[model samples]
Target chain A: AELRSFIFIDRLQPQTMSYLGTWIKGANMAAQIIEVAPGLDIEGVTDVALKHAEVKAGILVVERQFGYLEFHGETGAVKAAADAALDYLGGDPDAAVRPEILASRIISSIDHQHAFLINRNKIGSMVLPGESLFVLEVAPASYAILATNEAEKAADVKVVDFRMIGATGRVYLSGTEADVRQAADAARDALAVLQG
Target chain B: AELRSFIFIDRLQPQTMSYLGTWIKGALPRANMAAQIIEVAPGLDIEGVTDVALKHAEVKAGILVVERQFGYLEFHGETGAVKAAADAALDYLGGDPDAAVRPEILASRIISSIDHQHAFLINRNKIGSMVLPGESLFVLEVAPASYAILATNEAEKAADVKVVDFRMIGATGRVYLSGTEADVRQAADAARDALAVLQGAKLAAALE
Candidate 1:
């Protein structure tokens, strides 16, 4: 199994945790997101993490090209479980794929049509017209959650939607122009520091 | 308001219909049923299309998804009902189905004697059938999304391949099939040929 991403969130923000609750079935607190290649290998990683620590599994999807496992609990437990999964993969955390920013853009004062179309598909909050919107697409999909959590901590923005699975990760946030700019910077900075 | 795909399947193969049963939230379709798939831009336009088709005929809807950039609707029933419902949807769009966007094949490849790891990974997400090791695998990606079903049904009619999975929504459509090398090759040929016919239809419409 190849470690694609090994992300640990020390704390789960209100909007992030609420967003997870919308789709993820399991419990949550501090979270750990893991991505591995040969997707089925995630089953073994899941076994290792759950057995080694007291974390609740949230997202365990074997996607087209990779396997993703997300679990959350107390900070210590989340870290311990993440460590166990990494050991099972025989992978170094630093060796995980660096988060690559594919596309990032901010649309100020979004048009009503665009906001309506976006709101129709979003799973989180609605993006009202006139609000500035920030959109980010990144690779190594799991980093989406990390970016969203950090941005939530840094600025006040509505979590329109953030998809942390599939071919790539995508994030949508909306707010006043100033707050949206702050959130975009924080999201980009989070991924940039991870790229280093 | 833009028509991305307006596809009609005369007959849904057993594997193709059964695969739709696995995940589609609306009514389940049986083998040999006719189906219509429509994809449109702006995504929310699908709601209006759905309202028109369901009210116009006795077709059963199988999928109604509004993705990031497109809205998709799939309905299946008897041949006449499917055709009538599809016509009503076309009337709502004020567009000719033949003028819809043509499918562009992005990637199509056949891997013979697939590795165990690759097979396992594919099987993990597949809903139709399990792909065993040593079987040849056919993978295809096409744009305008909904043509995936037309490709899969036609391929199944022409070859003895298993329907591993096919996604007909999102940015593009993807089809996966596994079988013996000869059968997979036959499936790939038939799938591409089906899409090719639509490409020709678009050209003929333009010339007219």
Candidate 2:
């Protein structure tokens, strides 16, 4: 009924991040980075995820730098499509990506400049597998990207999706209650001083 | 920071309910109906109406939005309360109730609906986002421009509805939301409810 999608990258390229981010706009969707790591196979994995996914808007990462990707529309389709493409290389599905939770709370409540959405033990489909999930919608893709980068590094949580496109941007992460809390706080702090 | 009045009459008299329901240019008819947004001169005795509302809680369906120049009232399940309210409102205006500013009754281009208009039992408070797609989008325009965002937030909290647009930018505030018929109705109720008593310092404290 509503637009939803999820993707996780164990590794992606740092330099190619902006390139892929820009590509999503041509596809008529917004994209942002949630987490990034060094030592990622950017082109190799990009080929794996993009091979068969006809996504409207999506998150993308490059290289061996660990990056998180999330977007709006056909998230399930993206997973299936990537799983199929990566299968030809004999990569273990579990190794490439893992499907976690199924249910999540998407309803967003904004109070002043602060907004929070929490899903406890979700059912159906999830952005990432963990006990809890949190996503913050903010402005300036660079600020969101910077926050997600700092959050994943400073806090022990999974950067599920970090999208910064158009007028609004989002940061998604999942993990232990304490860590999720930590990352959310990190993003909030970054949002205050970090201008686009 | 403007003030306006709204009156909700639930289970209202058929003709008057129909009359008030059809007052807004484009709205769907519902079992309970109310009217609001009548302009008044600055210094209108708003507390007088509030006192009247306090007096006639028996009607069990009266809400007052007090403003110096204007005020709004709403009733959900009774008409007698509305009649009493109209009288009190007229007394505040120092004139005949019938002679007061009447409803404009805008034509119904479209009104928000949920469940294909099957769930007219929607709460009048929680309407947040608005759209004109088919028969699912319902809009209510009232005073205190800030009511738009307040209603939008409350409505989103009430149901699984999406906000199409909300405005507090004009003389009148408007909120447009879309969702399941039931959800939209619930959102409408939340919107109406927020409009009822959530104002100024009180509103912020109530939600947070």
Candidate 3:
């Protein structure tokens, strides 16, 4: 119901988005910067961002994909992402590149382009053990890169471990020892080969 | 057409600049309190400047920019100055200048000497012939010396405006026309001078 509400109506405006950002899902992503935004209302994050000069004509919606079946063990996981995304995108004034229309990002192989290409496999079919998902909100220009575990500094990419959700709604993650790189790496790699 | 749009573009950001003290154009001395923005659009002559800020945000472009002819006379007025003023403003809890205007002011304006060079003219004291350019959202930020007119400042932006008060969106203007000593005087002279010129134009046009 939560996913259905968000996908269809609840996030239509900033008023309702804030209500959803506060709720967390999945015990693994608990201490992570799961949710971030100001005022706790959908409009609060956008409002503060505009007032604080984060973006002048700032108003946009960015939608990320996945969560159905793939994370069946955590039924509310997708709902959590939707809620957190809505709040941080519109409710958090300090999400690096907020209020300027990001969220066009896709973390998984699901392509919104093909509406009929919906989920077929159950959660167990495509489940990864202990794979934590985190959204990396970039700065100044509306970038929200999705990743997992902790961010590691590559000598060239300048990886920094962002470990806190600040009062201003900035989320950072870093330093994961998992065999895989960023949580989105597998999917991103698949995308790389398929030209996704 | 673009310049006309620029002249009236304040409507898009309604919270920014209001005007009980409408501009007369030409030399600074020629600017006058012309019309509360709407009357010009409606072809009605008001006793002084008027504004309606508490209204809606989006306005009909034709409604605001409409140039009407009255008694075989005509004038071009600003569109949505008040609404634009309010829209451009940072509504952080309240509309107080200090709280709302401080952080929201563009960096350039802060860099310039415009700091204490503006003024406000309240609704009551505007010239009998003066009119707001558009909606009431534009509380005139006329500088002092322009003081012969009425104006008010927000409680927070006192350093720039020189005085402070809190007033809701009411029909009347309850404010302190502000600015430092010199700029205030200059703005006053400027307003008075413009009115004098317009009154002259009226008489000359009538051949009276």
Candidate 4:
């Protein structure tokens, strides 16, 4: 699926986040990432959200903190579904959903090639409260393989995932608090000499 | 974004022996790593406890197949990317049910561990003869070390069968049974029936 529009929501009611994740997932809408504010809901909210959309669904990922929802589909269906969800949630449909911008260029950050690119653009906490995350954004997707091999060779770390898709590739590594710290820097250093 | 395929067996419908295995693997040509499919026991879904294992990040490498009284999936990359290409198959099976109570069907099988869903492998040779006319092969995705034991119990009671393999961890909680077509069908129904009858209220409280 082509990257459609990434919309960021500043805030959302926490109680309904899980229900929203399940429903949006079940709706079969194309949502890459949906971040929501968290809380508890004994009863699921899938039906509640399903009531708002009349269009065919795709994929959606939710970010639970800022109430962010990334919908991937035709611009029309995404907007339609987003509007319906906003209105149903009691928000002024137009004011709540805002477009997010991806500022990194297609090619750059060459210096930090192998090392984890630590920044605000988190790809879903593949980490824990005390744990650390070493990330690498590689181009040509397959480079993620080389990065992982290098990481494993230098340190015993957890390869959380190698997202081999889209314009930029992402690698997630987790391990002993002390170990991953070294592994991250080592990976970065290795990237300087390795061919893409 | 668009859906390449979607396959869903509605509640209480009896599935053919090889249908589940064949369909799930058919959608893998474009994926980097094959996806994992686990069949959960019925109550697991109702209790909203289907993803207990996947959430822990215990599954590593390949598709993390798991199931309870329900079904689940874990893929190496974007699940959304796979779903977008896989939702269409579920549409073909969409239909009206028999009313009163309709239970969905679930299967257990390993799809992406190998290339195609065909029974034969690149190096392994087939036994003396082929599938032979009346014989059948059935796969069900059952989970929880205990749930699979329960499924085995029901399947044995329903028909005399052979258990090809039963995987209990890391992407598979599946069972393969071989027997006459009718017997295999009976075993599948019984296995599903057993899960459907599991105590929901009690399990809901116990799942934690």
Model 3 spans > 4 angstroms off = A1-27, A30-143, A148-187, A190-196, B1-4, B9-208
| Every model's DockQ | 0.05, 0.03, 0.01, 0.01
- Residue B80 error, candidate 4, Å: 49
The runs of at least 3 residues in candidate 4 whose Cα sits more than 4 Å from the true structure, single-residue gaps closed, are: A1-196, B1-117, B122-134, B199-208
Q: Which docking category, incorrect, acceptable, medium or high, applies to candidate 3?
A: incorrect
Candidate 3 chain A, run of 10 with poorest lDDT: A63-72
Model 2, B89-206: lDDT tens digits are 5566554433332222111112433231112212222232233333355455544443454465666667766665454333445555666677778878876766555333245555
Off by over 4 Å in 2: A1-146, A153-196, B6-49, B54-58, B62-73, B76-81, B89-208
- Candidate 2 vs candidate 4: the TM-score winner is 2
Candidate-wise lDDT, in order = 0.85, 0.42, 0.23, 0.37
Worst 10 residues of 1 chain B by lDDT: B113-122
Per-residue lDDT for B38-116 in model 3, tens only? 2211223321111223232332222221222310111222444434533332131133222211111000011112211
Ranked by DockQ from best down, the candidates are 1, 2, 4, 3
**What is the TM-score (0 to 1) of candidate 3?**
0.19
Q: Candidate 2: which docking quality band?
A: incorrect
| Higher-TM-score candidate of 1 and 2 | 1
- The number of the candidate with the highest lDDT is 1
User: Which parts of model 1 have CA positions greater than 4 angstroms off?
Assistant: A1-196, B205-208
Best by TM-score: 1
User: lDDT tens digits, residues B103-160, model 1?
Assistant: 9886676877765545665676678799898898888777777889999999999999
